[PDB]
Every structure is written in C-alpha cells, then in structure tokens.
Amino acid sequence: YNVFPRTLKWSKMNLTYRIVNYTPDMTHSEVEKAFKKAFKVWSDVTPLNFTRLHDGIADIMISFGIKEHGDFYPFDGPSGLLAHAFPPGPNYGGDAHFDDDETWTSSSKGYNLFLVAAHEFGHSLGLDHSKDPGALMFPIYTYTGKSHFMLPDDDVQGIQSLY
C-alpha cells in the first residue's frame, strides 16, 4: 500500500515548465528570459533543475489571464493580486497564473515579471508567505530598487528546509 506525504514538495529534482501564453507588454523573448531567471533563483540554492517544454503537459504550467480564468482565485484588475500559484502536486499543482491586467516589465516600472515569477515559483515549490517585509516571499510587492537581485536569507532557509 501507499500513503500521501505531509509537507507538499516535489520528490523529483528535474521539473518541467511550459509558457502556455504571453502578455502583450513584453517580447516573447523577454518573457522567456524573465521566467528562466526566476527559475535560476531557485536552482542556484537547491538541487532542482527546470527544463522548458514547447507543447504538452508540464509540471509547472505558466499562463496569463484576467478576472475569472478557470479556478477559485479570480484576478481583480490593475494592482491588488498580481499572480498566484498552486503548491506541489499532480493535476494543477505547480501552475503559476499571472494577472494580465498588470503592466509587466523588465524594470522598476509597473510590476517586474521576473520578481513576481521568482515569488510565485516559490509557491510552486512549496513555500508559503513570510512575515519578514524584506523577504521575497513577503505577500506584498515592494521593489527595493537595488542594482542586482539577491535572494534574501529568509527564503534560502525556507527552501532549504524543503530541498
């Protein structure tokens, strides 16, 4: 016989993702680079690797939508909820949805896609929100406007307790 695991995490180290569709705000290329950067944040601090699929069912299905888009987490227009993700598991587990009523950018303007993706992929991997306002996993977007991105220690300890 078998039993479910308590503590949601991936048991396999090589995960796949697929970008199902694209925001108008950025180039296909800029969106691909952003999500790849966001996965590299996590592969640099864990044994996980992330490979991209062009078709088929991937472990992490990435899409953009507005308002009601096919689950119980409807978006709400500009600002408010930026994105959400499902925790690790079969079916919809790992999927990351981005609100296409945001202005997505590769900069300090609007919402930085890489940054929000880094955060949501945290949920995809099994991290919940942090109480530390400096944390990547803090529930509220707060662009620090530093030159380069550094994963704060709070999120390193969290991810290391899982993987």
Ligand X SMILES: O=C(O)c1ccc(Cn2nnc(-c3ccnc(C(=O)NCc4cccc(F)c4)c3)n2)cc1
Q: Which parts of this chain interact with ligand X (CB under 6 A)?
A: 82, 106, 112, 114-116, 119, 136, 138-146, 148-149, 152
> Of 30, 32, 68, 120, which residue is the catalytic one?
120
With CB under 5 A as the contact rule, which of the stretches 4-12, 21-29, 48-56, 122-130 interacts with Ca ion?
21-29
* Displacement of CA 24 from its chain's centroid (Å): 19
**Angstrom distance (rounded) from CA 97 to CA 117:** 9
- Pick one of 9, 16, 22, 25: the residue that binds Ca ion (CB under 5 A): 25
Q: Is 28 annotated as a binding residue?
A: no
Closest C-alpha among 118, 51, 116, 60 to residue 86: 60
Is 32 annotated as catalytic? no
Output 33 or 84, the one with its CB closest to Zn ion. Answer: 84
Quote the least distance from Cβ 110 to ligand X, whole Å. Answer: 12
Q: Please check whether residue 60 is in contact with residue 94, taking contact to mean a CB–CB distance below 8 angstroms.
A: yes
Token readout for 86 is 């499902």
Q: Name the residue with tokens 């977007």.
A: 141
What one-letter code names the amino acid at 69?
H
Phi, psi of 122 (to 5 degrees): -55, -45
Annotated binding residues for Zn(2+), written as ranges, equal 69, 71, 84, 97, 119, 123, 129, 137
* Residue numbers annotated as active site: 120
Which residues contact Ca ion (rule: CB under 5 A)? 23, 25, 76, 80-81, 94, 99-100
